[PDB]
Design a protein around this ligand. Structure first.
Ligand SMILES: Nc1nc2c(ncn2[C@@H]2O[C@H](COP(=O)(O)OP(=O)(O)O)[C@@H](O)[C@H]2O)c(=O)[nH]1
Ligand SMILES: [Mg+2]
Ligand SMILES: [Mg+2]
Ligand code: NA
Length: 414
């Protein structure tokens, strides 16, 4: 039989609103991550979507139909059992132009990504643009482009967009990114996408010796498939492990942590706890590693782990030395253009005293610019951030025409 292991790789699913990201995830995994009624009433889904699947291959059958997402070779007409390859998970990021912060939060978790392009819309739409550039800034360059909704366009219409997409990727880091046509709604050519995932999003090397760090995704910020148990021993803290491994009973801390307000002054103090359980889906494990959304069961009271007063951005081992900073210095670069705007706009230079939005790990922090000198800015944050390394790239956004627009990036200097 197929083993029950954690997912070993996170694949983002990005692209413009209504291009079919959530449907594509369902096509691969059988899971519909969002709530249809809420998406109807709000006109968008604001939470990250999450789903997992096994990947196998029917060694008797031919490609790409030999690739399967279940332990059956029926789809290629064989009764042999498929060879298990790996378990993978998907981060379904929002496309709506007001949700760039949530996309950037999800992009911190991706080992690769799929950019979904609708074939019946003019390429490239503003968030096709903005998400593509965001992926390149952040370093998620194991990319597959998917031309979705081919069922509604002619052969000539798909070919014509295909040429637009090749012209767009030409002369960029994505110049050799494959372009796979599919219908997510009717599950057309999904096996070729699976074949592409195996070829172009190989599981990354994990140095399991590094200090364990998990980026936190608050439960109210993500839609995950249904759970059998909500852990009894205390509140659960979910997220994705970006380095090292965590083990049951290890002492850990949640950073920045709990808001404490005493004699006027405000601080965020670390919340120490201990790993009571480790879950992926509804499977229990003794350890957790990078790849997948893990549920870390603690002994904390659920009223703390779900509190808004808890600034839970990362989890580390209890003895890790992690600065928690209200003021940070960023070595920054700006984009030439505001790629995600509808109008053609140049990015203005960073002015002192303006408000910026900083994406660090999975967290989102507003800040004021106290100092601009050359290519370094100094920012006084509204809430501190936990800088777990000296190597951390933040993404910078500015409010433009009543939306948060990605305008550049930087290195957080400590
Ligand atoms: N005709 C057709 N419609 C599709 C296809 N994929 C998605 N859709 C429709 O496009 C709309 C938006 O899809 P959705 O998955 O919610 O897009 P998202 O905003 O990117 O998550 C839905 O009404 C889908 O049923 C497709 O392959 N063909
Ligand atoms: Mg969606
Ligand atoms: Mg149909
Ligand atoms: Na077609």
């Amino acid at each position: 039989a197929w083993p029950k292991v954690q997912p070993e790789v996170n694949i983002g699913v990005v692209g413009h609103v209504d291009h079919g990201k959530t449907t594509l995830v369902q096509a691969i995994t059988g899971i519909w991550t969002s709530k249809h009624s809420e998406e109807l009433k709000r006109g968008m889904t604001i939470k990250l979507g999450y789903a997992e699947t096994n990947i196998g291959v029917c060694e008797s059958c031919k490609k790409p139909e030999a690739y399967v997402t279940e332990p059956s070779c029926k789809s290629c007409g064989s009764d042999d059992e498929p060879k298990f390859l790996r378990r993978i998970s998907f981060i379904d990021a929002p496309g709506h132009e007001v949700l760039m912060a949530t996309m950037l939060s999800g992009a911190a978790l991706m080992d690769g990504a799929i950019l979904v392009v609708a074939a019946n819309e003019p390429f490239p739409q503003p968030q096709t643009r903005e998400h593509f550039v965001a992926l390149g800034i952040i370093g998620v360059k194991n990319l597959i482009i998917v031309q979705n909704k081919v069922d509604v366009v002619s052969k000539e219409e798909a070919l014509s967009q295909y040429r637009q997409i090749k012209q767009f990727t030409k002369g960029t880091w994505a110049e050799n990114v494959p372009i796979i046509p599919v219908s997510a709604l009717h599950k057309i050519n999904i096996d070729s996408l699976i074949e592409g995932i195996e070829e172009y999003i190989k599981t990354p090397y994990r140095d399991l010796s590094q200090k364990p760090v998990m980026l936190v995704i608050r439960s109210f910020d993500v839609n995950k498939p249904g759970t059998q148990f909500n852990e009894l021993k205390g509140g659960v803290i979910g997220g994705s492990i970006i380095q090292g491994l965590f083990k049951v009973d290890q002492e850990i801390k949640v950073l920045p942590g709990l808001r404490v307000e005493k004699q006027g002054k405000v601080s965020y103090e670390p919340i120490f706890t201990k790993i009571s359980s480790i879950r992926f889906g509804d499977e229990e494990f003794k350890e957790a590693k990078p790849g997948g959304l893990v549920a870390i069961g603690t002994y904390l009271d659920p009223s703390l782990t779900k509190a808004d007063n808890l600034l839970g951005s990362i989890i580390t081992l209890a003895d890790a030395e992690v600065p928690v900073l209200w003021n940070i210095r960023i070595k920054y670069n700006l984009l030439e253009r505001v790629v995600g705007a509808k109008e053609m706009l140049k990015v203005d230079p960073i002015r002192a005293k303006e408000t910026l939005m900083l994406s660090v790990g999975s967290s989102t922090t507003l800040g004021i610019v106290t100092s601009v000198k050359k290519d370094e800015i100094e920012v006084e944050l509204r809430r501190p951030v936990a800088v777990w390394s000296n190597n951390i790239r933040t993404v910078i956004s500015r409010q433009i025409a009543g939306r948060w627009r990605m305008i550049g990036w930087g290195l957080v200097e400590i």
